Amino acid sequence: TTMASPQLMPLVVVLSTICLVTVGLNLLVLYAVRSERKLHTVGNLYIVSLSVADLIVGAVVMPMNILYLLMSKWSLGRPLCLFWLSMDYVASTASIFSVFILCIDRYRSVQQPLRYLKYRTKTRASATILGAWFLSFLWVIPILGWNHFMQQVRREDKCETDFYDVTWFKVMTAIINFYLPTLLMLWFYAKIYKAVKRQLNRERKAAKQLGFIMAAFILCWIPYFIFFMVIAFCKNCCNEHLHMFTIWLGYINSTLNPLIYPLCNENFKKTFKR
Ligand SMILES: COc1ccc(CCN2CCC(Nc3nc4ccccc4n3Cc3ccc(F)cc3)CC2)cc1
Fold this sequence. Notes:
The protein is mostly helical. The chain has one domain (6-272): Rhodopsin 7-helix transmembrane proteins (Rhopdopsin 7-helix transmembrane proteins, Up-down Bundle). It contains 11 helices and no strands. It is globular and about 60 Å long. The relative contact order is 0.12. It binds the ligand COc1ccc(CCN2CCC(Nc3nc4ccccc4n3Cc3ccc(F)cc3)CC2)cc1. Residues 71-78, 146-167, 234-239 are extracellular.
């Protein structure tokens, strides 16, 4: 019945725990924000956007990915697989765009906290978050319309994105979506950290929070992306174990961010203590 060998259970039994902990922590963060007035700041809007993206990548893709791992097939509804892809790619890129927006906001604030003050109303933070989410949801077009744009799954042993066999698009979208946000974020973070070390202490807790979030990303997703852009050329080169572990390393990052917040802010630990 497309089962898995009894030696593949002792890891799914903990993947389910990771799935439940991701949605038990992100939901806790979200309820913390909507239960206390002190947490309706500007950067907490970006934190909420990140927590929502992690809730989606912990509640929609985690159980579907676990079921796909346990049952090595996806003859389980073509539109359902399309929805899983459209809620995996969009969530994973929305997390990295929300982090990018937060990093730009903090870099503008640390630029000079006398010139970026009239562009920090919460309405504009919400507008930027909605714009980032729109750019993320733009990922629906290629997945659902590659058979319409390029005159080209038809593979029922496993459902996959329609451009998996398109090396040029894969490498180009990987380069853009990861590297350019990653490079820009690293540049902004270095520019922040220089000034923060320069002046002086809430700055050396907020800078550490942003640095830990960025470290989480650039250190838990890059094992996936280096493999993704080395596999785009090597075709006799298909180690499934490393790929399957790197994807779940990124998912562990999604789980870790809700643990990152308590250990970098006192307000979050004060509202998590009860
Ligand atoms: C059981 O076997 C399987 C086999 C396959 C799968 C799919 C796993 N899925 C996991 C998440 C992956 N996201 C992803 N790849 C990308 C390639 C180019 C551009 C963006 C890409 N993005 C989104 C992203 C964006 C920024 C970022 F910082 C991180 C990611 C896509 C793959 C699941 C189970």
